[PDB]
Design a protein around this ligand. Structure first.
Ligand code: HEM
Ligand code: HEM
Ligand code: NA
Ligand code: NA
Ligand code: NA
Ligand code: NA
Lengths: 248, 248
């Protein structure tokens, strides 16, 4: 359903150069998971019914960063400012989504297709649209389905983003990594979900909800058994997420 | 002059998966410069006149690792063994060259084209073919030109590989990084060469030789002024290096 806008040759040149610089920066700084979280929280405010929110640069606003669910994302925005300044032609919206795509790539994940042209919008969406870690499948469908317009498959695949990174007791309150290799993008999130609670690894109530839902569970099983299938569905879902409200 | 061999679909699938896994591993382990050094020392033993040496997996042999110029590369080989074992179909030769290509990519450098099909050869080349850091332009031409068959342009561009990493007093004896950002691949090696010896940054006699040679100096100037030109020439040179003796 996408009709991507035209951007100038200079814009495309900046996208390509920024992608390279983001690889080096994100790898060196060890901030891939934080950048993926930034991209997801930027995009995840989209409401399809009103066509409000989504990946339009508003997460840079102190007002949006102050949202409870966005604790710690001010670090991500600050980390990217010097590099963003080297690419003044790029929108913040494109830059943050490119950082999310790069975060997945540098940690060994699939290559998520990227299309430039998001415009920075003036007003942050209302607070409270982002997923709630303490709730289950009904709420996941409310957020990803009813608001964002993504599928049940997308929900499970995107939950696999937790294969990189960790929670922090000072941010959400939850604490620790989902996987034994929090800078490696693979299907281990699903493997860990299936094996039960191993010592030192995190499972949110929202992660656990995937195991007991009739639609989500077969997907968990599939991804645990078949990393290639996970990578394919993940790339599809991440692309859709990164493009909510954009190019239709 | 290259006619690349055919490899099976399964081989190509392993190349693509290994490339991803190498990105994640190399980024996490912070070993990009060591892996680039490994790939360069593997390839740099090629002698065009005899068609001996080159990137054919022999650097994995304890006998080749024992070469003075290869101090510390046993670490690189060890680091890669677990991942290599996940891709039994791949030659070590291809795996090490792919690691070098990935090292450049993850640090923000150009995308160096990669072609599979190098076969692992039984016998390491004689010791003493690798570049000597204490010598100058004549010796650089002996090694890169007379032996490897690379151009003067290739010599200067490849010297820019020192934009990542550092020397170690326990390995070569030289000590410290060439650049202020040793995990970032950019044209800073050349910028530093031109500005003089800044505190805490390394310049080998072989680096300094580039500044006073009539052919090498204009290239240093070009790369210092134009990072895009450096990236283009670097990608060309690295590809050629990685393919010495291979596919003609
Ligand atoms: C499915 C609903 C989701 C819930 C309930 C959820 C919740 C959370 C929570 C509570 C944290 C911990 C924040 C902290 O304390 O630092 C977190 C972190 C993270 N989230 Fe999710 N999230 C969801 C979806 C996503 C999606 C769609 C992505 C991207 C594909 C994503 C990527 C990440 C990453 C990479 C981290 C680690 C951040 C770091 O290491 O600093 N999450 N998420
Ligand atoms: C031009 C002739 C060259 C000379 C004289 C030379 C010499 C050296 C020396 C003495 C070291 C330090 C080893 C140590 O003590 O750890 C080193 C490291 C390194 N070399 Fe070169 N080299 C040359 C060419 C190359 C090429 C062609 C490449 C790849 C394009 C390369 C990539 C590297 C890298 C990335 C390191 C850092 C390794 C680390 O951080 O552990 N070098 N080189
Ligand atoms: Na955004
Ligand atoms: Na992981
Ligand atoms: Na090799
Ligand atoms: Na550097």
């Amino acid at each position: 359903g996408k009709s991507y806008p035209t951007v100038s040759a200079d814009y495309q040149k900046a996208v390509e150069k920024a992608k390279k610089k983001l690889r080096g920066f994100i790898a060196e700084k060890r901030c891939a998971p934080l950048m993926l979280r930034l991209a997801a929280h930027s995009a995840g405010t989209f409401d399809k019914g009103t066509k409000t929110g989504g990946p339009f640069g508003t997460i840079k606003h102190p007002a949006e960063l102050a949202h409870s669910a966005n604790n710690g994302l001010d670090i991500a925005v600050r980390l990217l400012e010097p590099l963003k300044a080297e690419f003044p032609i790029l929108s913040y919206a494109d830059f943050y989504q490119l950082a999310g795509v790069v975060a997945v790539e540098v940690t060994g994940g699939p290559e998520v297709p990227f299309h430039p042209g998001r415009e920075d919008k003036p007003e942050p969406p209302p607070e409270g649209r982002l997923p709630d870690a303490t709730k289950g499948s009904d709420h996941l469908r409310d957020v990803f389905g009813k608001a964002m317009g993504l599928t049940d498959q997308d929900i499970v695949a995107l939950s696999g983003g937790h294969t990189i990174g960790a929670a922090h007791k000072e941010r959400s309150g939850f604490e620790g990594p989902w996987t034994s290799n929090p800078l490696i993008f693979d299907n281990s999130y699903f493997t860990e979900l299936l094996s039960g609670e191993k010592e030192g690894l995190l499972q949110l109530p929202s992660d656990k909800a995937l195991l007991s839902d009739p639609v989500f569970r077969p997907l968990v099983d599939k991804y645990a058994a078949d990393e290639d299938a996970f990578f394919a569905d993940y790339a599809e879902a991440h692309q859709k997420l990164s493009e909510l409200g954009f190019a239709d």
